Design a binder for this molecule. Structure first.
Ligand SMILES: Cc1ncc(COP(=O)(O)O)c(CNc2cc(F)cc(C(=O)O)c2)c1O
Ligand SMILES: Cc1ncc(COP(=O)(O)O)c(CNc2cc(F)cc(C(=O)O)c2)c1O
Lengths: 404, 404
């Protein structure tokens, strides 16, 4: 017969690396806001694969683009041109109003690309001596698992045991304009990379005016503002980009995750010519970056977010979600935070009761969510969810929280 | 009407980064050994997207796996289990006889993973003090474009303008056992990473006995042998792994590219428990690593290489290819090298005549190949090619080389 859930956990234990400890649920099917496990149980997805399935699981329009293009051509490499990449490049640069895009595959590769752009612009345009360029990051950041990405982390689970670390990366507190102003006094700083809302730090929303103040200070001191929108971008917070809430234009914008609707790893680095063209032919890229299959998928994924007005839906339904979550007793849920459909609750963790136990019981009651920190639970369902579906989910959350 | 080739080049010039200078040909369809451009011209593919389409373009079995799984589920993230990943993990670990695999997406991420494994094993098993671990690489190496990967490169096009660089990376000559023996005297060395045949250095095949000597020296000095088989693995050289030619077992094996038949970025890191399990839950991973769509594709891609005996075909036809290429006059083609269907010629470059011009004319005559170094041309067609097709391709190469 087909493997049970326990079989599935045990087989991965034997033959796969132990780099994750997932919540014990074994899915085999996803459609829209729902997931089904191998026993046939149905769940609400309140993680959305960290924003990658904003459009819902297996969105038919995005599937159709994949199935149409896989019959024509999937990979030429960049040794030649394929016919899809320029159509995608025109579409996304016009959509976000930047001169150019550099295509990559995973979110961390977009971050690496942005660090390379910042350094090469710092040396060739700003006039920093080679190799004294610095990049500033905010404590709590997470942008992936390469040696460079963990070198900017303050999370020991990211960096401990994996050094020595990349030089030239400085760290300041998040949501702290005086600290950024102090860091940018060094003319060897080339850029500041920052998430408009910190995802893995626990959905940390900075104070109103932070993003405008970051833009003002970067401009004043001739520093590039890199906005990592790999989780916050593409409608998840209720705008096309979370920086749109303060009408702020970063110098470099990073996209990923929902760029493909979860059907393909596609990421993107957006900026104008004065930054982009510091990288010359032969100096950067990726085997799969800009391949025609990912590009057809990304065009469709972007079209879905536009045609279905998913940013408006995320905004309106996020307000319902936070308002209803705030009714839970303060002695058990100590904070509700978020924008759009990127939200989190904080739990009054005890000796025995923690975020992991809440998420186990949420799973028992038909809802899938992921803990972090032991007292933080993310709530981020796909943006195609409807109000009726949202309210049923909240009832699952209430039932679970109040069952303890 | 539909864009012409020139239209396609111009649109990418306007809206995409200038990080590549591709050969001027604009493809829209691929099937098996062939590619078609937007004018309907048919070409032999003699690049195979740097080994990623070993199985030929759009292999029907691999397409079928993609189309079947995209209807069920494509991405849960590793916050939960999907049902496909363990089936893939069992298959590939049994196929290559290692305890475990760690799934990632791109080749450079597999390399980053291996560096993290080597460092964490060096600290926790070998007893190196944090953070003094070193990794040795061979001059000429290429394993991608992250800040760490360019820090081990000796190619200025990879690293110039992008420092400062990752510490702890030492470089020795390729194909040089005395130099490796000298480097491994430092007990803070944790690993040696090496390609069994250097791809982007120009298909540099080391001398017989090199890989055995590397294995012997690594074992003697308690150093991990990391074999980067992202281009050489998966039948391209006429064995499952290029290290099979000397019956050598690395400690860590890196796979990528052909792992998906070009339909999806899938990469893999293979090693035994004493190395793999130095990474604990929460310390490494990737959003898309091990997603169920890539895994179904990778299972099918691996099955194709086995069922169709593509390593045997690559071996037998590689010998024909090198033998026929060696008939070209020595004054124009100064070297022929390779194993299996990973081969290159070296050209007697002049003031006016170079590898780029040869490849332009090869394209005119129906064959697509890529230059490197100005005097090196790669010849690497998909492994499903037949002898009759191979001989027609050689006739295109002869016609072109002898037309100058
Ligand atoms: C031996 C070995 N190991 C790892 C990697 C990284 O694989 P990946 O690209 O998935 O990160 C590569 C990449 N090969 C390659 C060769 C080339 F001529 C151009 C490109 C390009 O980027 O356009 C890439 C590799 O050759
Ligand atoms: C803001 C931001 N920027 C870049 C990246 C890198 O994206 P990528 O994974 O494609 O390289 C991420 C990754 N998010 C994330 C969150 C999480 F809880 C687990 C994982 C995991 O790896 O399992 C990944 C990111 O949150």
């Amino acid at each position: 017969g087909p493997p049970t859930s326990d079989d599935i956990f045990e087989r991965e234990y034997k033959y796969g690396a132990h780099n994750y400890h997932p919540l014990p649920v074994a899915l085999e099917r996803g459609k829209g806001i729902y997931l089904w496990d191998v026993e046939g149980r149905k769940y609400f997805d309140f993680l959305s694969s960290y924003s990658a399935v904003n459009q819902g699981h297996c969105h038919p329009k995005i599937v159709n683009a994949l199935k149409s293009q896989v019959d024509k051509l999937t990979l030429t490499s960049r040794a030649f041109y394929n016919n899809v990449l320029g159509e995608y490049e025109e579409y996304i640069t016009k959509l976000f109003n930047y001169h150019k895009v550099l295509p990559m595959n995973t979110g961390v590769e977009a971050g690496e690309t942005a660090c390379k752009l910042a350094r090469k612009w710092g040396y060739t345009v700003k006039g920093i001596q080679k190799y004294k360029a610095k990049i500033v990051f905010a404590a709590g950041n997470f942008w992936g698992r390469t040696l460079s990405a963990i070198s900017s982390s303050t999370d020991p689970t990211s960096y401990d045991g994996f050094g020595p670390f990349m030089p030239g990366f400085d760290i300041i507190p998040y949501n702290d304009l005086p600290a950024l102003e102090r860091a940018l006094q060094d003319p060897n700083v080339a850029a500041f990379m920052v998430e408009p809302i910190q995802g893995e730090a626990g959905v940390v929303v900075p104070d109103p005016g932070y993003l405008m103040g970051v833009r003002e200070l970067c401009t004043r001191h001739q520093v590039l503002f890199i906005a990592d929108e790999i989780q916050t971008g593409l409608a998840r917070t209720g705008r096309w980009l979370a920086v749109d809430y303060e009408n702020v234009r970063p110098d470099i914008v990073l996209l990923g995750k929902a760029l493909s609707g979860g059907l393909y790893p596609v990421s993107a680095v957006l900026c104008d010519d004065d930054i982009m063209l510091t990288i010359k032919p032969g100096e950067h890229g990726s085997t799969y970056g800009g391949n025609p299959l990912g590009c057809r998928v990304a065009i469709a994924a972007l079209e879905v977010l536009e045609e279905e007005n998913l940013a408006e839906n995320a905004d309106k339904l996020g307000i319902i979600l936070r308002n209803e979550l705030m009714k839970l007793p303060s002695d058990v849920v100590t904070a509700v935070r978020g924008k759009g459909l990127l939200n989190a609750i904080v739990i009054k963790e005890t000796k025995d009761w923690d975020a992991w136990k809440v998420c186990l019981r949420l799973r028992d009651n038909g809802l899938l969510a992921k803990p972090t920190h032991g007292d933080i639970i993310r709530f981020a369902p796909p943006l195609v969810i409807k109000e009726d579906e949202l309210r049923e989910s909240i009832e699952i959350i209430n039932k679970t929280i109040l069952s303890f």
